[PDB]
């Protein structure tokens, strides 16, 4: 879907830029204006989550023992469990993407960079497949940008 591809554009770019330090300058799709703003929002909010919760994230990562593409699946299972209480909000969504970026950095560090795009797509799939109706009601990535706007 268009929402899947836009979400993947944002999440894949954030995870890969976080892991490698290199911005992706390739042109975006037709929703690029919103995607650029959502990426800028993630750089602010998501970088903050990872730093503020680094110790906790490190412990979670250790317990997951992520070594290869067969382990990338565990993050999708974490996401499903987060949403199992029936609650959806942007704070949870950005926290899951931020943990995804933390895992992406780990994958680069262990020279499993080829696992990052599968991770980004796995996160995108859980979000869009299971929360499509909520995302649409919240006006999608435009709503995400508006929610986290300051001043």
């Amino acid at each position: 879907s268009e929402l899947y591809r836009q979400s993947l554009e944002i999440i894949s770019r954030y995870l890969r830029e976080q892991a490698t330090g290199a911005k992706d300058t390739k042109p975006m799709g037709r929703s690029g204006a919103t995607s650029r703003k959502a990426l800028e929002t993630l750089r602010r909010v998501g970088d903050g989550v990872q730093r503020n919760h680094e110790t906790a994230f490190q412990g979670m990562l250790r317990k997951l023992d992520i070594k290869n593409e067969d382990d990338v699946k565990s993050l999708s299972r974490v996401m499903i469990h987060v949403f199992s209480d029936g609650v959806t909000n942007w704070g949870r969504i950005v926290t899951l993407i931020s943990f995804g970026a933390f895992v992406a950095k780990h994958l680069k560090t262990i020279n499993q960079e080829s696992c990052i795009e599968p991770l980004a797509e796995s996160i995108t799939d859980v979000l869009v497949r299971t929360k499509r109706d909520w995302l649409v009601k919240q006006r999608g990535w435009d709503g995400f940008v508006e929610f986290f706007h300051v001043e």
Binding site: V49, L64, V82, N89, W90, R92, I93, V94, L96
Partner: peptide
């Protein structure tokens, strides 16, 4: 999935606290 469930509860709390502040 004991480990995964506990990680998820922790991330849910972090996410909810973040949402609260916004």
């Amino acid at each position: 999935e004991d480990i995964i469930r506990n990680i998820a509860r922790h991330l849910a709390l972090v996410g909810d606290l973040l949402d609260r502040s916004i």
